[PDB]
Design a protein around this motif. Structure first.
Motif, PDB file in Angstrom:
ATOM      1  N   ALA E  21       0.854  -1.176   0.000  1.00 37.16           N
ATOM      2  CA  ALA E  21       0.000   0.000   0.000  1.00 37.16           C
ATOM      3  C   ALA E  21       0.894   1.232   0.000  1.00 37.16           C
ATOM      4  O   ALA E  21       2.124   1.127  -0.044  1.00 37.16           O
ATOM      5  CB  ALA E  21      -0.947  -0.012   1.202  1.00 37.16           C
ATOM      6  N   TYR E  30      -8.098   0.038   3.499  1.00 38.48           N
ATOM      7  CA  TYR E  30      -7.935  -1.112   2.625  1.00 38.48           C
ATOM      8  C   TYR E  30      -8.246  -2.424   3.329  1.00 38.48           C
ATOM      9  O   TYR E  30      -8.551  -3.418   2.662  1.00 38.48           O
ATOM     10  CB  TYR E  30      -6.502  -1.039   2.084  1.00 38.48           C
ATOM     11  N   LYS E  33     -12.625  -1.979   4.603  1.00 36.98           N
ATOM     12  CA  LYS E  33     -13.600  -2.178   3.537  1.00 36.98           C
ATOM     13  C   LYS E  33     -13.739  -3.654   3.183  1.00 36.98           C
ATOM     14  O   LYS E  33     -14.858  -4.163   3.016  1.00 36.98           O
ATOM     15  CB  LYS E  33     -13.199  -1.354   2.317  1.00 36.98           C
ATOM     16  N   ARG E  34     -12.619  -4.366   3.077  1.00 37.81           N
ATOM     17  CA  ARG E  34     -12.708  -5.793   2.813  1.00 37.81           C
ATOM     18  C   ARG E  34     -13.331  -6.538   3.987  1.00 37.81           C
ATOM     19  O   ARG E  34     -13.981  -7.569   3.788  1.00 37.81           O
ATOM     20  CB  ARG E  34     -11.333  -6.367   2.490  1.00 37.81           C
ATOM     21  N   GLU E  79      -6.394  -5.409  -5.041  1.00 39.85           N
ATOM     22  CA  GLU E  79      -5.994  -4.138  -5.625  1.00 39.85           C
ATOM     23  C   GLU E  79      -6.849  -3.031  -5.023  1.00 39.85           C
ATOM     24  O   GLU E  79      -7.916  -3.283  -4.461  1.00 39.85           O
ATOM     25  CB  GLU E  79      -6.129  -4.160  -7.154  1.00 39.85           C
ATOM     26  N   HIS E  80      -6.368  -1.795  -5.137  1.00 37.64           N
ATOM     27  CA  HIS E  80      -7.058  -0.677  -4.513  1.00 37.64           C
ATOM     28  C   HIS E  80      -6.664   0.618  -5.202  1.00 37.64           C
ATOM     29  O   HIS E  80      -5.553   0.740  -5.724  1.00 37.64           O
ATOM     30  CB  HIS E  80      -6.742  -0.602  -3.018  1.00 37.64           C
ATOM     31  N   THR E  81      -7.585   1.577  -5.195  1.00 38.07           N
ATOM     32  CA  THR E  81      -7.384   2.880  -5.806  1.00 38.07           C
ATOM     33  C   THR E  81      -7.832   3.955  -4.828  1.00 38.07           C
ATOM     34  O   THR E  81      -8.880   3.826  -4.189  1.00 38.07           O
ATOM     35  CB  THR E  81      -8.162   3.009  -7.123  1.00 38.07           C
ATOM     36  N   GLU E  82      -7.035   5.011  -4.717  1.00 34.69           N
ATOM     37  CA  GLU E  82      -7.329   6.090  -3.784  1.00 34.69           C
ATOM     38  C   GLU E  82      -8.360   7.031  -4.405  1.00 34.69           C
ATOM     39  O   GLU E  82      -8.927   6.761  -5.467  1.00 34.69           O
ATOM     40  CB  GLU E  82      -6.043   6.814  -3.400  1.00 34.69           C
TER      41      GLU E  82
END
Lengths: 44, 147, 57, 49, 83
Positions: E21, E30, E33-34, E79-82
């Protein structure tokens, strides 16, 4: 006082503990500033 | 107004204000103050500036100065000026309530003085007496002796 | 000095012709007494400045 | 009858004081119904009259 | 990598995730939320399993959703997006 109940119920039911969609201490002050003829618009 | 009447249009109270803001220009007065601050500087420039404050603050805003003058006055949710009686038969009511009722009364007063048709001077007295109520309903203690 | 002059002008505040002449002067003889005299310290610039001639700081 | 808000009159600076170019102690009399003022005037109507 | 069995919460480690991250706050979100996703997968048995992939790794006795999430994050399964 309307959130602690939702929380107790959520936990006892095992669902995701909720989140205030929009802050809550704001509404009485919102009313009484609108009542004073001062337009207020919660933006987004 | 008897003679020379239709050549000028006099008014009294906020009504006149309303008129002079309806048939009113903003960017014209704005550029007037701008050319003043750039041409007629002197010492009274401070006034040109302090005044164009509100004009160029009233330019890209979705709120004409009409918001000052009130043709539709709100009231507060009753619970916020609470009224509740204790055990035994005795009330306990907010203090703001009084002012509200006064407005109400005066409104109806004037609203029937129109049917009374008294000359414009009794009308001025009653309008003064009704706006004296808002003079303190919003902030009591602002003009002369308070309620 | 100023208080004495205010209680003086109270004369015309309530002695308009006989006394007051408003619908308040039967129980409260002083509605306009202490609404004109307690407002003239606010409607004062003329009064206060033309007083400054007779008692200047 | 219309009425105003005190902050825009007792603003010190009074916000009506400047938007209208009129100083207080003069609107003091206007809004409290103690004097009369005029909206506008007709230059061309008066010139030929 | 020269350390001993990380015990309890400390497994999965922290310096391992902080490279999965941008920062530690982003890791807080992150993971939270999961966790919501895992919980909403568990609570919903009638509605078919769609839009809720479940846990990408094998759970344990109960292995509360936050631990499952941080483990998945250690395995590089997300995967993750800000904003």
């Amino acid at each position: 006082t309307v959130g602690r109940v939702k929380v107790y119920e959520a936990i006892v039911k095992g669902e995701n503990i909720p989140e205030p969609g929009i802050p809550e201490s704001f509404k009485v002050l919102l009313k009484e500033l609108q009542s004073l003829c001062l337009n207020v618009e919660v933006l987004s | 107004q008897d003679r020379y009447g239709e050549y000028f249009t006099g008014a009294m109270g906020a009504e006149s204000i309303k008129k002079l803001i309806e048939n009113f220009d903003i960017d014209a007065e704005a550029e007037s103050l701008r050319e003043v601050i750039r041409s007629g500087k002197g010492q009274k420039k401070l006034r040109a500036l302090k005044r164009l404050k509100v004009v160029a603050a009233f330019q890209q805003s979705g709120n004409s100065p009409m918001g000052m003058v009130l043709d539709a006055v709100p009231v507060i949710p009753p619970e916020l000026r609470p009224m509740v009686q204790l055990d035994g038969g005795r009330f306990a009511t907010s203090d703001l309530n009084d002012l509200y009722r006064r407005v109400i009364n005066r409104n109806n007063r004037l609203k029937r003085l129109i049917d009374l048709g008294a000359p414009e001077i009794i009308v001025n007295n009653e309008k003064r007496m009704l706006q004296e109520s808002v003079d303190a309903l919003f902030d009591n203690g602002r003009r002369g002796r308070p309620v | 000095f100023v208080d004495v002059v205010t209680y003086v002008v109270t004369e015309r505040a309530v002695a308009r012709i006989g006394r007051g002449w408003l619908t308040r002067d039967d129980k409260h003889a002083w509605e306009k007494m202490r609404a004109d005299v307690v407002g003239e310290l606010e409607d004062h610039e003329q009064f206060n400045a033309a007083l400054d001639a007779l008692w200047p700081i | 009858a219309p009425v105003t808000h005190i902050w825009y009159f007792k603003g010190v600076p009074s916000r009506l004081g400047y938007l209208l170019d009129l100083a207080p102690k003069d609107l003091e009399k206007i809004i409290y119904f103690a004097a009369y003022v005029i909206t506008s005037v007709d230059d061309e109507m008066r010139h030929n009259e | 990598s020269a350390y001993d069995t990380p015990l309890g919460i400390t497994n999965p480690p922290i310096d391992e995730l902080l490279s999965r991250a941008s920062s530690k706050y982003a890791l807080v979100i992150y993971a939270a939320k999961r966790a919501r996703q895992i919980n909403d997968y568990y609570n919903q048995l009638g509605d078919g399993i769609l839009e809720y992939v479940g846990p990408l790794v094998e759970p344990g006795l109960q292995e509360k959703p936050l631990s499952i999430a941080l483990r998945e994050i250690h395995g590089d399964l997300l995967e993750h997006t800000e904003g």
